[PDB]
Amino acid sequence: VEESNGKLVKIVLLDDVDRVGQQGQTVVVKAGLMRHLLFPEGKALYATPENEAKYS
Amino acid sequence: YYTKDGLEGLLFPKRFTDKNLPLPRPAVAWHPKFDGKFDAVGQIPPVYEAV
Amino acid sequence: QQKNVEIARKLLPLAKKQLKGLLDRQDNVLWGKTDIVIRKRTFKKNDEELYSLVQVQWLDVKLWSNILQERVPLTLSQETLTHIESIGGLDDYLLKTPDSQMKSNFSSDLRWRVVCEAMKQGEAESKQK
Amino acid sequence: LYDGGQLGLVKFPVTRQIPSYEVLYNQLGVSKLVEFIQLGLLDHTKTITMK
Amino acid sequence: EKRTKRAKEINDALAKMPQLIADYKAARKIDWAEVSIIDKLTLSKKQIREKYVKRRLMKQN
Amino acid sequence: YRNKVTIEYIKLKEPENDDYATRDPTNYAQLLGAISISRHLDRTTYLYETFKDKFDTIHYVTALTKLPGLVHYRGADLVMRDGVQWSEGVKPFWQKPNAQPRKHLLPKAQGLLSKLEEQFPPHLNNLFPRQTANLIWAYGQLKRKQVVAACPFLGDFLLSLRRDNFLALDKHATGADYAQIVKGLANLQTAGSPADEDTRALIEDFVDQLTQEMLLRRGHARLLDAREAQSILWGLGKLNRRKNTAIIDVLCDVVLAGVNSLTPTALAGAFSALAKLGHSSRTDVFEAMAKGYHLQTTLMSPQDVSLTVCACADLGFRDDNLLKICGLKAADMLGEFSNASLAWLMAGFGRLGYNHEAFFSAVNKSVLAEPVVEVEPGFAWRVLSAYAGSGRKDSESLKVCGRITEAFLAKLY
Amino acid sequence: LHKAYAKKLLKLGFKRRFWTDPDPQMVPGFFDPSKYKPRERLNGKPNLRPDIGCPALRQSQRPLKKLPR
RNA sequence: CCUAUGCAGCUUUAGGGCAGGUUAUUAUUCAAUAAACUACCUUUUUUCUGGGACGGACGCUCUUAUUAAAGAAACAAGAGUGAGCAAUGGUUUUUACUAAUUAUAAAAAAGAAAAGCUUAACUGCAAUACAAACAAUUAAAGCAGGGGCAUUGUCGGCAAUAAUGCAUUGAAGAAAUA
Ligand SMILES: [K+]
Ligand SMILES: [Mg+2]
Ligand SMILES: [Mg+2]
Ligand SMILES: [Mg+2]
Ligand SMILES: [Mg+2]
């Protein structure tokens, strides 16, 4: 994700997802997927150090 | 064999004592590329002898 | 700073007009990490130098803001979008950055709106809890 | 210094040899060292240093 | 190490030099046992030398 | 493509933080930033004239607190240090005594401040302890400089803090608030014109109550560092609060713990403050401060030398190493000392009974070199006392004293 | 060199003794790591441009060229 | 009309560039690169000459007139040349031979041809002269080393007089440093 130039982001899952993964799992998903569906719907948060400690 | 700082101490020791500064320290050894150019490492206060 | 001005004065007459047009858009966009890049051309057979400007690719996107519960249209460069995604989104970008770094009227107005709304909701929630 | 267009001075080759670094040293002749001792400006009964 | 290798190569070459010189001289000598021009009694010795020496050298080359 | 081309891309680096220098603010936050980071009075005046109606309580407070920094001292009253750069507690210059502001800045500051004071009164009831402390500190600075003579709102600021047994401080007090309140009040009672009798009584009464109830009884001194504690000690000394010594011991303890962070300009202040208060039993505290001059000798100025010597004589603390440092530094800075200042310094050595060869030798050489000497009665006896007390003998001091007597007799007012 | 040409060079101040200049970095004990520069090859091409070249190699000064615009 | 350290405008399949548009390729949700087409920017386009243009010419040898020392010019005249040879180079022996070259009264202890052996068509230096504005160009006794043919002489290319190109930049073999 470091060299993805913003195309890939680390995602922390708050609720079980059909394909991305389960709650508490840190995964890598396409930037567009998080921007449009997962983030506004409220099912996941960005994998920042604060979010990982609080949720992951 | 003297370095830049060592040569200054040899020539003008008073320039350091008047300011209460320790004298420069001598070198440990010279680069091997200069083998056959020097016989000994100079001491900042030279040791004088009789002739 | 002195070197930046010296380079700018060496730009081609048409490139100077393009540079001014780019700068005048600062108050209308979310400047973010946008930076100015100069193209310099050199040749082997002569001692000639040509200075020209490198354009910025602007992107129109809609980012989600949970505090405002809205998708805010924004004009961004790719670098700015990458930084916002990394830091934690639009809300974290506006709440983790001082007004001095924004360097934009559009950004400053948006940040001021978010800060005031966050305090109101937080104060009410804090009193409740 | 212009010669009319012939430019005869730049018709010669170029040499790039680097001279020895020892051209930066101060040269002292043995005959000059003795003269100072004979006149009495140097003490020959003890070690003589660059100082 | 490089100087040692270079000295070794030159020493080996000089050891083989006497044989190379012998072949050089021999290859340019006329073998009268393979000459039929004398049987023809038509050409001079110089013409015989060119005809057979050239053939031998070209074949060796 | 006969003529090959090489392409280089040059990025124009810019400062990370914007300086609000030319653009006009258009928001609540932008206006606050422009006022805070203003560089000149003309900029602050322009902002007030244009955006007068778009002001709040915070905007008025910020403008007042920054005004003292926009008033600059004369270039003739400042001396530049060699290679010193701005840092934490260190400036690139030292000030001569009683420095004066620039000639053309006083009318601007006075005019700007008058407008601000006119529109402020409605906002007096919406201030917090932090805002009150900053306002008190700013006015004290504005009085030390020749901008104001008194604080119109002093009665209101003190009442706000005093109400409900310092209830506001009990919840919103920090180490900075106590340092600014005490320091500001001291500069409002001593700097410039001495004081008014009613003003002096109110300020001294408030300081005594604040120190005992908050810093001592409630143990708020735990919020103070070495610098803040030192500032409080200076304020108490100027106010001559010698009755209470319990707080002085507490403040001295804080200074002792954080001695390393203090610079020579701060150590000298502690010496003078203790000397004024007469607290001379803390020999251990004096020893720790003396050890701080060993390494920072390059940050000492003539004011620090004079204060240290006089404070030591008054306190009766004689440290040979510290006195040696002051004497050697003073010998080179003789050109900077004034005639009155250099007489006090000489008298200080005499009282301590220390004879410094280099210091007195330099003074004697200078006096003899002067063809016509004119010593004033005000310090004629001081210089004579120093030579007698210091034990300087016939070598050359009798000649210097002889010239001193002749000059004094030449006038005999 | 021919006498006529040599006198002009001396009259202008030519006093070189060696083909190139010595390198102080080569003296033992006087090596400065900060002032390190890899040895470069001397350029043998004279500057013959009549606009910004050597005044001794051109008969008269020529006007400068126009800048791109 | 001719001559300039000339100037300007215009034209094009004279040189270079990409900085607008179109087009091609690639990439992100108004971009980057360019041997293309259009537009634009910048630069170059000798001299001699019975005035200039048109035509012709520009290096290096031989010969003719200006007598029998040398030298000597014209868009004067009559001819060559921008090489060849592994022997047509070096050196010994023999003799019913004494030619040829672009041109030419060279040469008999000399050459040519025939027969034999060879690589001096070398390494490192060189007194003294011819010529000559300078650069370069020409002849050369002699010294050391390793060789060839002779057996104590000659060989540092070719009967002689033409067969050529500074410095810079680039490349190859070897050696010394760092
Ligand atoms: K005519
Ligand atoms: Mg002409
Ligand atoms: Mg010559
Ligand atoms: Mg022989
Ligand atoms: Mg010959």
Neighbouring residues of C97: CB distance < 8 A, sequence distance ≥ 6: C111
CB of F64 closer than 8 Å to CB of F184 = no
Q: How far is CA F164 from the centre of its chain?
A: 33
The residue among F35, F36, F40 whose CA lies nearest residue F50 is F35
Tokens of E37: 């021009």
Which sign does the torsion angle of CA F57, F62, F63, F65 carry? positive
Q: How far apart are CA F126 and CA F135, in angstroms?
A: 13
Q: Which of residues 21-50 of G touch strand H (CB under 7 A)?
A: 43-45
Helix axes E2-27, E45-60, angle to 10 degrees: 140
**With an 8 Å Cβ cutoff, is A40 touching chain C?**
yes
Q: How far apart are CA F99 and CA F120, in angstroms?
A: 30
Encoded amino acid at D22, one letter: E
**With an 8 Å Cβ cutoff, is B48 touching chain D?**
yes
Tokens of F181: 């309140």
Q: How far apart are CA C6 and CA A1, in angstroms?
A: 38
Neighbouring residues of F90: CB distance < 8 A, sequence distance ≥ 6: F84, F263, F299
Closest chain C residue to the Cα of F28, Cα to Cα: C112
The residue among F303, F374, F308, F378 whose CA lies nearest residue F333 is F303
Chains G and D touch (3+ CB pairs under 8 A): yes
- If you ran DSSP here, which 8-state letter would residue B29 be given? -
| Contact residues, chain G, for C12 at CB < 8 Å | 68-69
For residue A19, the CA-to-ligand 5 centroid distance in Å is 99
| Contact residues, chain C, for A9 at CB < 8 Å | 85-86
- If you ran DSSP here, which 8-state letter would residue B22 be given? P
> How far is CA F98 from each of CA F74, F76, F101, F144, rounded to the nearest angstrom?
11, 12, 10, 9
Q: How far apart are CA B42 and CA B27, in angstroms?
A: 8
Q: How far apart are CA F54 and CA F121, in angstroms?
A: 16
Q: How far is CA G24 from the centre of its chain?
A: 19
Alpha helix ranges (H) inside chain C: 2-8, 13-23, 78-87, 90-95, 99-102, 105-128
Tokens of F94: 């030292």
10 Å CB burial of residue E10 (0-12, 13-18, 19+) is: exposed
CB of C67 closer than 8 Å to CB of C117 = yes
CB of C56 closer than 8 Å to CB of C77 = yes
F14: phi then psi, degrees, rounded to nearest 5: -130, 155
Residue A11 C-beta-side C-alpha neighbours within 13 Å: 28
CB of F10 closer than 8 Å to CB of C40 = yes
Tokens of A45: 């948060």
Solving technique: cryo-EM
- If you ran DSSP here, which 8-state letter would residue C76 be given? E
Tokens of F115: 């407008």
In this structure, which long-range contacts are made by residues D8-15, counting pairs with CB atoms below 8 Å and at least 24 apart in sequence?
A: D8/G5, D9/G5, D10/G46, D10/G57, D14/G42, D14/G44, D15/G19, D15/G20
Tokens of G47: 């500057």
Q: Is the CB of D2 under 7 A from strand H?
A: no
Tokens of B33: 């590329």
CB of C78 closer than 8 Å to CB of C69 = no
| Contact residues, chain D, for B49 at CB < 8 Å | 46-47
Neighbouring residues of F214: CB distance < 8 A, sequence distance ≥ 6: F166, F169, F173, F178, F220
CB of F209 closer than 8 Å to CB of F162 = yes
Q: Is the CB of G3 under 7 A from strand H?
A: no
Alpha helix ranges (H) inside C24-104: 78-87, 90-95, 99-102
- If you ran DSSP here, which 8-state letter would residue E45 be given? H
| Contact residues, chain C, for G68 at CB < 8 Å | 12, 48, 50
> A40 to chain C nearest CA, in Å?
6
Tokens of G43: 């350029």
Q: What was the resolution (in A) of this experimentally determined structure? A: 3.1
> C51 to chain A nearest CA, in Å?
28
Query: Does residue A19 sit in helix, strand or coil?
Result: coil
Query: Does residue B41 sit in helix, strand or coil?
Result: coil
Chain breaks in chain E (C to N over 2.5 A) after: none
Residue G38 C-beta-side C-alpha neighbours within 13 Å: 2
CB of F99 closer than 8 Å to CB of F77 = yes
**Number of H helices and number of E strands within chain E?**
3, 0
Other CB atoms within 10 A of residue B33 CB: 8
Neighbouring residues of F34: CB distance < 8 A, sequence distance ≥ 6: F20, F25, F43, F47
Q: How far apart are CA C85 and CA B43, in angstroms?
A: 65
Q: How far apart are CA C82 and CA A6, in angstroms?
A: 5
Q: How far apart are CA F305 and CA F345, in angstroms?
A: 8
C41: phi then psi, degrees, rounded to nearest 5: -115, 130
Residue F108, phi-psi category: left (phi > 0), alpha (psi -120 to 50), beta (remainder): alpha
Q: How far apart are CA F125 and CA D15, in angstroms?
A: 89
Neighbouring residues of D2: CB distance < 8 A, sequence distance ≥ 6: G56, G57, G58, G59
Q: Which of residues 15-74 of C touch strand H (CB under 7 A)?
A: 15, 39, 41, 43, 45-46, 50, 52, 54-61
Give the N- to C-terminal CA distance of chain D in Å, as an integer.
Answer: 48
CB of B46 closer than 8 Å to CB of B39 = no
Helix axes F129-144, F175-189, angle to 10 degrees: 30
Encoded amino acid at F247, one letter: I
Neighbouring residues of C75: CB distance < 8 A, sequence distance ≥ 6: C28, C29, C30, C58, C59, C60
Question: Measuring from the CA of residue G2 to each C1', which nucleotide is nearest?
Answer: H134
Query: Does residue C73 sit in helix, strand or coil?
Result: strand
CB of F167 closer than 8 Å to CB of F132 = no
**With an 8 Å Cβ cutoff, is C10 touching chain G?**
no
Q: How far apart are CA F283 and CA F388, in angstroms?
A: 28
**With an 8 Å Cβ cutoff, is D16 touching chain G?**
yes
> How far is CA G65 from each of CA A53, C49, C65, F128, F150, rounded to the nearest angstrom?
67, 14, 58, 70, 71
Q: How far is CA F270 from the centre of its chain?
A: 12
The residue among F65, F214, F217, F218 whose CA lies nearest residue F232 is F214
Pairing of strands A8-13, C37-43: unpaired
| Rg over CA atoms, chain B | 13
Neighbouring residues of E22: CB distance < 8 A, sequence distance ≥ 6: none
CB of C28 closer than 8 Å to CB of C107 = no
Q: How far apart are CA A34 and CA A37, in angstroms?
A: 6
Neighbouring residues of F163: CB distance < 8 A, sequence distance ≥ 6: none
Q: Report the 3 state secondary structure along chain F.
A: CCCCEEEEEEECCCCCCCCCCCCCCCCHHHHHHHHHCCCCHHHHHHHHHHCCCCCCHHHHHHHHHHHHHHCCECHHHEEECCCCCCECCECCEEECCCCCECCCCHHHHHHHHHHHHHHCHHHHHHCCHHHHHHHHHHHHHHHHCCCCCCCCCHHHHHHHHHHHHHHHHHHHCCHHHHHHHHHHHHHHHCCCCCCCHHHHHHHHHHHHHHHHHHHHHCCHHHHCCHHHHHHHHHHHHHHCCCCCCHHHHHHHHHHHHCHHHCCHHHHHHHHHHHHHHCCCCCHHHHHHHHHHHCCCHHHCCHHHHHHHHHHHHHHCCCCHHHHHHHHHHHHHHHHCCCHHHHHHHHHHHHHHCCCCHHHHHHHHHHHHHCCCCCCCHHHHHHHHHHHHHHCCCCCCHHHHHHHHHHHHHHHCC
| Contact residues, chain C, for G69 at CB < 8 Å | 12-13
| Contact residues, chain C, for F3 at CB < 8 Å | 43-46
Other CB atoms within 10 A of residue F411 CB: 11
Q: Which helix (H) or strand (E) holds A28?
A: strand A26-30
Q: Is the CB of E5 under 7 A from strand H?
A: no
Residue found by looking up tokens 């340019």 in the block:
E28
Which sign does the torsion angle of CA F377, F381, F382, F383 carry? positive
Q: How far is CA C28 from the centre of its chain?
A: 10
**With an 8 Å Cβ cutoff, is F27 touching chain C?**
yes
> How far is CA F97 from each of CA A43, F176, F349, G31, rounded to the nearest angstrom?
68, 27, 21, 51
Query: Does residue C64 sit in helix, strand or coil?
Result: strand
Which sign does the torsion angle of CA F222, F225, F230, F236 carry? negative
Encoded amino acid at E54, one letter: K
Strand H, nucleotides covered by protein (CB < 7 Å): 5, 7, 15-20, 27-35, 41-43, 87, 114-118, 133-136, 166-169, 174-178
Q: How far apart are CA C42 and CA F39, in angstroms?
A: 42
Per-residue b/e over D10-43, b at no fewer than 16 CB within 10 Å?
Answer: eeeeeeeeeeeeeeeeeeeeeeeeeeeeeeeeee
Neighbouring residues of F111: CB distance < 8 A, sequence distance ≥ 6: none
> C48 to chain F nearest CA, in Å?
11
Q: How far apart are CA F336 and CA F329, in angstroms?
A: 11
Residue found by looking up tokens 């610098």 in the block:
F227
Query: Does residue D34 sit in helix, strand or coil?
Result: helix
Alpha helix ranges (H) inside B1-51: 4-11, 14-17
Residue found by looking up tokens 């933080």 in the block:
F17
> How far is CA F380 from each of CA F302, F403, F411, F412, G9, rounded to the nearest angstrom?
21, 11, 12, 11, 74
Q: Which helix (H) or strand (E) holds E8?
A: helix E2-27
CB of F189 closer than 8 Å to CB of F203 = yes
In this structure, which long-range contacts are made by residues C70-77, counting pairs with CB atoms below 8 Å and at least 24 apart in sequence?
A: C71/A40, C72/C110, C74/C30, C75/C28, C75/C29, C75/C30, C76/C29, C76/C30, C76/C32, C77/C32, C77/C33, C77/C34
How do the residues of chain A divide into helix, strand and coil, expressed in percent and rounded to 5?
A: 30, 25, 45
| Residues paired with residue C75 on neighbouring β-strands, in sequence order | C60
Chains C and A touch (3+ CB pairs under 8 A): yes
CB of F64 closer than 8 Å to CB of F55 = no
CA angle F345, F349, F351 (to 5 degrees): 115
CA angle E38, E42, E46 (to 5 degrees): 75
CA angle C9, C14, C20 (to 5 degrees): 65
For residue E30, the CA-to-ligand 2 centroid distance in Å is 70
Neighbouring residues of F83: CB distance < 8 A, sequence distance ≥ 6: none
Of D45, D47, D50, the CB nearest to B11: D50
Query: Does residue D35 sit in helix, strand or coil?
Result: helix
